[PDB]
Design an enzyme around this catalytic site. Structure first.
Site, PDB file in Angstrom:
ATOM      1  CG  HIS A  61      -1.769  -1.167   1.408  1.00  0.00           C
ATOM      2  ND1 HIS A  61      -2.800  -1.492   0.549  1.00  0.00           N
ATOM      3  CD2 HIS A  61      -1.756  -2.126   2.359  1.00  0.00           C
ATOM      4  CE1 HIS A  61      -3.376  -2.607   0.961  1.00  0.00           C
ATOM      5  NE2 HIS A  61      -2.755  -3.016   2.053  1.00  0.00           N
ATOM      6  CG  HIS A  91       2.475   5.956   6.475  1.00  0.00           C
ATOM      7  ND1 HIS A  91       2.134   5.837   7.800  1.00  0.00           N
ATOM      8  CD2 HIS A  91       1.433   6.576   5.868  1.00  0.00           C
ATOM      9  CE1 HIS A  91       0.934   6.356   7.990  1.00  0.00           C
ATOM     10  NE2 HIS A  91       0.487   6.810   6.833  1.00  0.00           N
ATOM     11  CG  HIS A  93      -0.808   8.683   2.278  1.00  0.00           C
ATOM     12  ND1 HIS A  93      -1.494   7.487   2.258  1.00  0.00           N
ATOM     13  CD2 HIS A  93      -0.619   8.987   3.583  1.00  0.00           C
ATOM     14  CE1 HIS A  93      -1.731   7.097   3.498  1.00  0.00           C
ATOM     15  NE2 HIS A  93      -1.203   7.986   4.322  1.00  0.00           N
ATOM     16  CD  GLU A 103      -4.027   9.818   3.011  1.00  0.00           C
ATOM     17  OE1 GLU A 103      -3.878   9.868   4.250  1.00  0.00           O
ATOM     18  OE2 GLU A 103      -4.424   8.795   2.412  1.00  0.00           O
ATOM     19  CG  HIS A 116       0.135  10.632   7.359  1.00  0.00           C
ATOM     20  ND1 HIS A 116      -0.857   9.946   6.690  1.00  0.00           N
ATOM     21  CD2 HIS A 116      -0.100  11.948   7.134  1.00  0.00           C
ATOM     22  CE1 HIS A 116      -1.657  10.809   6.090  1.00  0.00           C
ATOM     23  NE2 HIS A 116      -1.220  12.028   6.342  1.00  0.00           N
ATOM     24  CB  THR A 195      -6.096   8.351   5.860  1.00  0.00           C
ATOM     25  OG1 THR A 195      -4.769   7.823   5.718  1.00  0.00           O
ATOM     26  CG2 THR A 195      -6.078   9.665   6.650  1.00  0.00           C
TER      27      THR A 195
END
Ligand SMILES: NNC(=O)c1[nH]c2ccc(S(N)(=O)=O)cc2c1-c1ccccc1
Ligand SMILES: [Hg+2]
Ligand SMILES: [Zn+2]
Length: 256
Positions: A61, A91, A93, A103, A116, A195
């Site tokens: 992911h 991590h 996104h 996000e 994050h 999230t």
């Protein structure tokens, strides 16, 4: 199972995880003209000097950099938080293009990526118990924009080759998360959720106003990662972000 593609992405999540349509979901758009300065907020305290990273993992992911949280070594306190929250992992996104990837959004503006840093409330003993509580987690969100390289990110960038596909991990010791922070700790804060599935509503979100800049070559290496496992058809790890969710008259507070 869950992913970010057309058949398993964010608007399919509600079926396995009904809380996806809940009352405090994340991320949200930060409307800067609706957020109110809050004088009752203590200064934010980010203590990462004694942080102990363990390893980096591609989970199909995103990638997690994991930390030893068996002692108070890297902690978040102050701001909207009561007590001490321990860093467990960080991590990102990110998008397929620089114009998307974050996000949270700021007056509808999408950044190239979002970092994050995930912390759990030490009154709950461990992460697993913390995520059963409305104040179990604190996530520090930091926006990324494309510009100059971020030197403190390069060690992460360098290791990504070794963890290309789902399930791969690598030793990642002595990584200092202080190298990922912007100058200012000015932030917005609101109560929210994970999230990612299971989307649990356990998070005090602290989102920094000031983005960090990363180089185009740094972000490009993020985009070389794979969602798929080794030996499977290549599915690039890009656009692993949940879009903004209904604010539902929660109140976003500003520290500034
Ligand atoms: N990555 N593995 C995990 O178990 C995980 N734990 C999390 C806790 C919080 C958050 S958050 N994004 O709302 O900051 C994310 C995670 C994750 C996770 C992060 C990225 C992709 C898949 C799972
Ligand atoms: Hg919760
Ligand atoms: Zn995240």
């Amino acid at each position: 199972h869950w992913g970010y593609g057309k058949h398993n992405g964010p608007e399919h999540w509600h079926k396995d995880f009904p809380i996806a349509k809940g009352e405090r979901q994340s991320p949200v758009d930060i409307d800067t003209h609706t957020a109110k300065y809050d004088p009752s907020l203590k200064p934010l305290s980010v203590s990462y000097d004694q942080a102990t990273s363990l390893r980096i993992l591609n989970n199909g992911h995103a990638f997690n950099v994991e930390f030893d949280d068996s002692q108070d070594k890297a902690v978040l306190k102050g701001g909207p938080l009561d007590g001490t929250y321990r860093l467990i992992q960080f991590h990102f996104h990110w998008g397929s293009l620089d114009g998307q990837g974050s996000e949270h959004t700021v007056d509808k503006k999408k950044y190239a990526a979002e970092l994050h840093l995930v912390h759990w409330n030490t009154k709950y003993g461990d992460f697993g118990k913390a995520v059963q509580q409305p104040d179990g987690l604190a996530v520090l969100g930091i926006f990324l924009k494309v510009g100059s390289a971020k030197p403190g990110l390069q060690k992460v960038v360098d290791v990504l080759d070794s963890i290309k596909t789902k399930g791969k991990s690598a030793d990642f010791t002595n990584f200092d998360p202080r190298g990922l922070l912007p100058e200012s700790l000015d932030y917005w804060t609101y109560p929210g959720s994970l999230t990612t599935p299971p989307l649990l509503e356990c998070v005090t979100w602290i989102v920094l106003k000031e983005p960090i800049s990363v180089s185009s070559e740094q972000v490009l290496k993020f985009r070389k990662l794979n969602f798929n496992g080794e030996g499977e058809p290549e599915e690039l790890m890009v656009d692993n972000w949940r879009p903004a969710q209904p604010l539902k008259n929660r109140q976003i507070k500003a520290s500034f």
